[PDB]
């Protein structure tokens with residue numbers, strides 16, 4: 001899988017994208033890798049923020065589906081026209097598939113001014129695809145039309161300073177991780193939903209009812225920057241993280257993500273551990289991240305920014321988690337693997353960690369229904 005290593009690029013704060021081609025002759029586009037959505041959607045009209053965009057009528061292999069799609073999202077939206085075309089990943093498996101593409105004709109707060117990507121590759125499942133679950137997501141088409149196995153793995157390497165990393169399609173590459181891979185079950189195939197069974201700050205249990213950590217869900221999402229937590233958990237998390245870092249004094253709004261801190265005393269800040277439901281009854285494992293993961297440089301204001309925040313739609317394990325680990329989206333076996341990333345940012349004293357087995361009872365109770 002060595003041709004796929006280092007196939008991701010990006011800027012800090014702006015996402016990880018992969019190069020793709022669409023149509024005949026191929027049109028090259030940079031596309032955001034997003035395990036928290038399920039549509040392959042590309043700019044297809046000259047929005048001023050875009051380096052380029054999909055031009056359907058230049059593709060001999062384009063097929064119109066004569067249906068529109070409108071996707072609102074909190075702030076803004078995207079709107080487009082559905083069709084299919086030939087899609088490949090130059091630094092991916094040497095194959096080409098006919099996939100659905102949503103050609104974005106109108107959008108607000110979708111494209112980022114100064115970014116170098118022109119679309120989003122939604123890697124989650126059909127259930128959350130727009131307009132509905134009959135628009136086969138790209139990865140489902142890939143697997144179905146080729147002999148590429150039903151899994152992908154992501155190594156996101158955090159640092160506008162340049163990020164990079166690897167999306168290995170169809171397999172795993174052992175140079176990308178150290179120690180062992182531990183798997184948590186994908187609870188249901190829509191988002192990549194998981195169950196968190198325990199949380200620890202520098203090895204001290206938060207001691208909350210574990211339903212609270214997954215209220216109303218927990219997902220693994222390469223499309224989000226932050227470690228996002230339900231309100232009750234965020235408050236307890238922050239209170240304990242404040243207590244650890246009581247020596248040096250930061251503004252009150254810092255913890256709410258309203259400002260930044262400069263100088264780097266990594267020692268002072270605690271490690272954060274999530275225990276995830278394991279593969280066996282009463283068995284869990286834990287993943288641990290360092291301050292290097294949750295203190296993100298804000299470049300264009302050594303200055304840093306607090307990247308844990310609250311949610312009404314559940315825990316999001318974003319880039320804050322994923323940059324610590326090699327994450328294996330093992331769809332064929334309905335499980336997600338974590339191992340220590342060969343590229344995670346650490347210091348000479350501590351590192352990110354994946355360890356087990358641990359004994360955790362009543363883990364099913366932690367799931368929300």
Ligand SMILES: CC(C)(C)CCNC(=O)CCc1cc2cc(-c3ccccc3CCc3ccc(NC(=O)c4ccc(F)cc4)cn3)ccc2nc1N
Nearest residue numbers: 013014015036037073076077078109110222223224225319
């Ligand atoms: C509603 C939905 C089905 C389109 C997505 C459901 N998923 C979520 O609500 C989870 C968060 C998420 C929200 C999204 C929102 C949209 C969207 C729809 C209409 C207008 C605007 C948007 C926002 C576009 C967007 C999404 C993610 C990002 N991410 C980053 O820039 C980023 C990612 C990683 C990182 F380390 C740094 C930055 C940037 N722009 C698109 C894809 C999304 N992908 C996601 N994983």
